[PDB]
Design an enzyme around this catalytic site. Structure first.
Site, PDB file in Angstrom:
ATOM      1  N   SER A  99       0.249  18.857   5.648  1.00 12.29           N
ATOM      2  CA  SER A  99      -1.269  19.262   5.668  1.00 12.29           C
ATOM      3  C   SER A  99      -1.913  18.661   4.260  1.00 12.29           C
ATOM      4  CB  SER A  99      -1.991  20.582   6.027  1.00 12.29           C
ATOM      5  OG  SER A  99      -1.249  21.498   5.197  1.00 12.29           O
ATOM      6  N   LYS A 155      -8.082  28.429   4.475  1.00 12.13           N
ATOM      7  CA  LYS A 155      -8.319  27.599   3.646  1.00 12.13           C
ATOM      8  C   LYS A 155      -9.847  27.382   3.329  1.00 12.13           C
ATOM      9  CE  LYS A 155      -5.117  24.202   5.747  1.00 12.13           C
ATOM     10  NZ  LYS A 155      -3.797  24.198   4.668  1.00 12.13           N
TER      11      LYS A 155
END
Ligand SMILES: Nc1ncnc2c1ncn2[C@@H]1O[C@H](COP(=O)(O)OP(=O)(O)O)[C@@H](O)[C@H]1O
Ligand SMILES: Nc1ncnc2c1ncn2[C@@H]1O[C@H](COP(=O)(O)OP(=O)(O)O)[C@@H](O)[C@H]1O
Lengths: 291, 243, 49, 48, 49, 48, 49
Positions: free
Chosen positions: A198, A241
Site C-alpha cells: 500500500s 490511515k
C-alpha cells in the site's frame, strides 16, 4: 474497534477518564481544576497515539505530582493552568509536527497502516554517486533500497522503478536522470508485511521529485497501490490511515476510487476540512502535484 | 499457637490488606491442624512467615520540604548540578500533585560516575528505605517471582525478599545495570518486569510462591544502565533517560 | 468432618451437577480414607477448597 | 497441573470460578494473538 | 469365528469428516466408543501410568 | 576499521559527496575519481 | 484466480499442499537490463525464490 480522532479524545477523556483519576487522588474539581486547554495541549505534545492510554499516563503523573504538592507540599489546592503545566511535567519534548515543511526534493510523506493504529512515515531518497560516470555508458541506473525491506518491497520497488522510467520517456525525453544515475532509496520500517504494497504509490512520486527536481506540493499525504502500467488498486484499513492524516494537519489526500465505499462510514466531524481526490489511472496524480 | 500469635501480634501492628487478612486467617487455622513433623507443614509455616513478614502499611515517613533535600544532596556529591536540579524537579512535580506519585527513571553514563551513591543519597534524602538489586544478564524470570511453592525448593521472588528485609511498605528499590539484562527467547524477564514497573499494576503484584497480591504502589524504582539505547524499546520508552 | 460439613451445607445450596455430586462423593470417601495430618491431606483439602 | 505434582495448582479458570461465585460469568481472556504455541504442549491448542 | 483387532488409518485434509465416521462405526459394530487425543503429547506415563 | 554496516552506507555517501565537491570546486583536479584509496575509521564509537 | 488476463510470464500450477490442494501461481521477471552488452557472453543466471 477503531482508534480515536485527536479532537474526539478530549470529549471522551474529559468525562469518562479525567473524573476517574480525580477520584483516585481524592480531590474534587473545586480545588483541582484542569481546563480543556491543558488537555488539548497535552495530547498535542506528549502522546500522538490513536489510543488514549498514553494521555492517561501523562495526566496520571501530573495528578500524582499535584497530590505530592498537597499531602506534604505547600498549596492546599493545586490549580493547574496550561501555562503552569510545563512546571509539573517539565518542558515540551516534541513540537515540530510534520518535520520538513518545504519538503526539499526527493523526500515524501506516506501513510502506513501499522500494526497498531496508523502513522504517516516519510520515505526518503537521494543520489548516491555522480551521474555522468560515462557519456557513452550503457549501464542501468541501479536503485538500492534500504530500511528493513521485505522481499515484497523488492518487487514493488522494481515495479515502481520501471514505471518511473516509462513515464519519463513518455513525458519528458530531454531528462535522462533515471536511466543514467544510481539512486538510494530508504523506506523507514513500521508497516506490517501484509499491508506492505500500500505504500508503493508514494514511492514513485518520491523519485519523480528528484527527477524534475521540484519540491512536491506541500503537506500532500497519499496512499494507493500501483499496477506496473499506471492503473491503481484498492488498499485496506483506510480509517486508521485517514485519522492519522487528520492528526498530522493534512489538508488533502488521494485514494483509489474503489475505496469510495468505506470512507463514507467515517463520522462527519472527521470529514470536515479535507478535500479528497479519488483516482484510477496514475497520470491524474502527476498533474495534481507538480504543475 | 506461638508462631500463629506472633503473626497475630504483628497483625495487630501492621494492617494487612483485608484479602491478606482473610488469607492469613485460613492459613493460620491450617497451621494448628498440621503435625510439626509433616513435610507440607514446613513449607506452609515458612509460607505464612513469608506472608506475615511483609510490611503492610509500615510507612517510613518522608521529608517533603524541598530544602532538606537540597542540603542533603549537596553534602555528599560535589557539582553535577544538572542531575540534582532534575531530581529536585521530579520530586517537586511529585509533591506538586500532593502525595508521592510513581514514574520510572533511568540514569546512564560512564561507569563509576557516582550513580548508585547518589541513588542511596536520595534514599536518605527522601528518608525512604534503600535496597539495591542488580539484574544484569538474568533470564530466570522465577527469581523475580519465586516458584509455585509446590515446586521443590521454591522460595518467593526477589521483590518479596526485599520487602521482608527493608520492612517498610514504601522502600526505594534501585534496579542496577538494566542495559545488560538477559533479554532472551528462554523467557524474557524484560517482558516480565513490565508488570513490576507499571505504576498501576505494582499495586497488585503477585508471585508464584504466595499468590496474594502485594501493594508496591509507593515504592520508588530506579534503573541504571551504562548506555540507555541497548534497553528494549518498550521498556526504555517508559522511564526517562537522565544522563 | 468439619471441612466436609461446611462444604456439604455449601453443596446443599449451590445446585451441583449430580454427576459431579457423586464424583465428589467418592472423592470425599477417599478423603475419609486420607489422614488428618498428611501433607497430601493438605493438598486434597485445598483441592476441596 | 495433575494435582499429583508437588506444588500443583488448578488452571486459571478454576480460580476465576472460585473468585466470581457465579456459574455463568463473562470471562475475558486477554491478548490471545501472542499466545505461546510451542512443542511443550501448546496451550493455544488446549484452548479449543 | 471370533471378533478380531486390526489397525486402520484414515488421513486427509482436516474437516473431511474423519472422527464422525469413527463414531458411526462404533454404533455400527455396537462396540463402546472412546476418543483419545494425543496431539502434541509427550507423556509416556499417559501410555503406561 | 571493524566497521558496522551503517558506517558503510554513510561512508559511500560521504565519498560521493567528495567526488561532487571537487568537480564543483576545482574541476581540473581529478585525484578522487582516478585513484584507489584505503580509509580507516578506528573502532570505538557506539553504533547509534 | 486473481489474474484473469494473465500477463506474460505467469502460469497457474496445481500443488498438493499439506491440506487439500491449491492453485498457486508461479511468476518470473527480469532483474537487470537485458542488453548489457550486444557482444556480452555471461550466463543468464537464474535466482529462484
Ligand atoms: N561527586 C561525587 N562525590 C563523591 N563520591 C563520588 C562522586 N562521584 C563518584 N563518587 C564515588 O565513585 C564511586 C562510584 O560508585 P556508584 O555510583 O556507587 O556505582 P558505580 O560504581 O556504578 O558508579 C562511589 O564510590 C562514589 O563514592
Ligand atoms: N460425509 C459427511 N457426513 C456427515 N458429516 C460430515 C461429513 N463430512 C464431514 N462432516 C462433518 O465434518 C465435521 C468434522 O468431521 P470429523 O472428521 O468428525 O472431524 P474433523 O473433520 O474435524 O477431523 C463434523 O461436524 C461432520 O458433521
Amino acid at each position: 474497534v477503531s482508534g480515536y480522532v485527536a479532537q474526539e479524545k478530549l470529549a471522551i477523556a474529559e468525562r469518562y477518564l479525567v473524573p476517574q483519576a480525580r477520584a483516585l487522588c481524592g480531590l474534587d474539581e473545586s480545588k483541582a481544576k484542569l481546563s480543556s486547554d491543558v488537555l488539548t495541549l497535552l495530547i498535542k505534545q506528549y502522546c500522538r497515539e490513536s489510543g488514549v492510554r498514553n494521555l492517561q499516563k501523562q495526566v496520571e503523573k501530573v495528578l500524582r505530582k499535584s497530590a505530592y504538592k498537597i499531602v506534604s507540599g505547600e498549596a492546599e489546592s493545586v490549580e493547574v493552568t496550561p501555562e503552569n503545566l510545563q512546571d509539573f511535567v517539565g518542558k515540551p519534548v516534541f513540537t515540530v509536527e510534520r518535520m520538513y515543511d518545504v519538503t526539499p526534493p526527493g523526500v515524501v510523506m506516506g501513510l502506513a497502516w501499522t500494526a497498531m493504529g496508523g502513522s504517516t512515515l516519510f520515505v526518503e531518497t537521494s543520489l548516491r554517486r555522480p551521474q555522468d560516470k560515462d557519456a557513452k555508458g550503457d549501464k542501468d541506473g541501479s536503485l538500492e533500497v534500504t530500511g528493513q525491506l521485505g522481499e515484497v518491497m523488492k518487487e514493488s520497488a522494481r515495479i515502481a522503478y520501471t514505471f518511473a522510467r516509462a513515464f519519463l520517456m513518455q513525458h519528458a525525453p530531454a531528462n535522462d536522470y533515471l536511466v543514467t544515475s544510481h539512486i538510494h532509496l530508504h523506506v523507514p520500517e513500521g508497516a506490517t508485511p501484509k499491508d506492505g504494497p500500500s505504500a508503493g504509490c508514494t514511492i514513485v512520486t518520491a523519485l519523480l521529485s528528484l527527477a524534475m527536481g521540484r519540491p512536491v506540493r506541500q503537506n500532500l499525504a497519499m496512499t494507493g497501490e500501483v499496477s506496473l502500467t499506471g492503473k491503481i488498486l484498492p488498499v485496506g484499513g483506510i480509517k486508521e490511515k485517514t485519522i492519522a492524516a487528520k492528526r498530522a494537519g493534512v489538508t488533502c489526500i488521494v485514494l483509489p476510487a474503489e475505496n469510495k465505499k468505506d470512507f463514507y462510514d467515517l463520522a462527519a466531524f472527521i470529514t470536515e476540512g479535507l478535500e479528497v481526490h479519488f483516482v484510477e489511472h496514475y497520470r491524474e496524480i502527476f498533474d495534481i502535484a507538480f504543475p | 499457637d506461638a508462631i500463629e500469635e506472633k503473626f497475630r501480634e504483628r497483625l495487630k501492628e501492621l494492617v494487612v490488606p483485608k484479602h491478606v487478612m482473610d488469607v492469613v486467617d485460613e492459613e493460620l487455622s491450617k497451621l494448628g491442624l498440621l503435625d510439626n513433623h509433616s513435610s507440607e507443614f514446613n513449607v506452609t509455616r515458612n509460607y505464612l512467615d513469608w506472608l506475615t513478614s511483609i510490611p503492610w502499611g509500615k510507612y517510613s515517613n518522608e521529608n517533603l520540604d524541598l530544602a532538606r533535600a537540597q542540603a542533603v544532596l549537596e553534602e555528599d556529591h560535589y557539582g553535577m548540578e544538572d542531575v540534582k536540579k532534575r531530581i529536585l524537579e521530579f520530586i517537586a512535580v511529585s509533591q506538586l500533585r500532593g502525595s508521592t506519585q510513581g514514574k520510572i527513571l533511568c540514569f546512564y553514563g560512564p561507569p563509576g560516575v557516582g550513580k548508585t551513591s547518589i541513588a542511596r543519597s536520595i534514599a536518605r534524602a527522601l528518608n525512604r528505605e534503600y535496597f539495591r538489586f542488580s539484574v544484569g544478564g538474568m533470564t530466570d524470570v522465577a527469581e523475580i517471582k519465586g516458584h509455585r511453592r509446590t515446586y521443590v525448593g521454591a522460595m518467593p521472588g526477589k521483590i518479596i525478599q526485599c520487602l521482608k528485609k527493608t520492612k517498610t511498605e514504601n522502600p526505594l528499590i534501585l534496579i542496577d545495570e538494566v542495559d545488560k539484562i538477559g533479554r532472551g527467547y528462554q523467557g524474557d524477564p524484560s517482558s516480565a518486569l513490565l508488570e513490576l514497573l507499571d505504576p498501576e499494576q505494582n499495586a497488585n503484584f503477585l508471585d508464584h510462591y504466595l499468590d496474594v497480591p502485594v501493594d508496591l504502589s509507593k515504592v520508588l524504582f530506579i534503573c541504571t544502565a551504562n548506555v540507555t539505547d541497548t534497553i528494549p524499546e518498550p521498556l526504555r520508552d517508559r522511564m526517562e533517560m537522565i544522563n
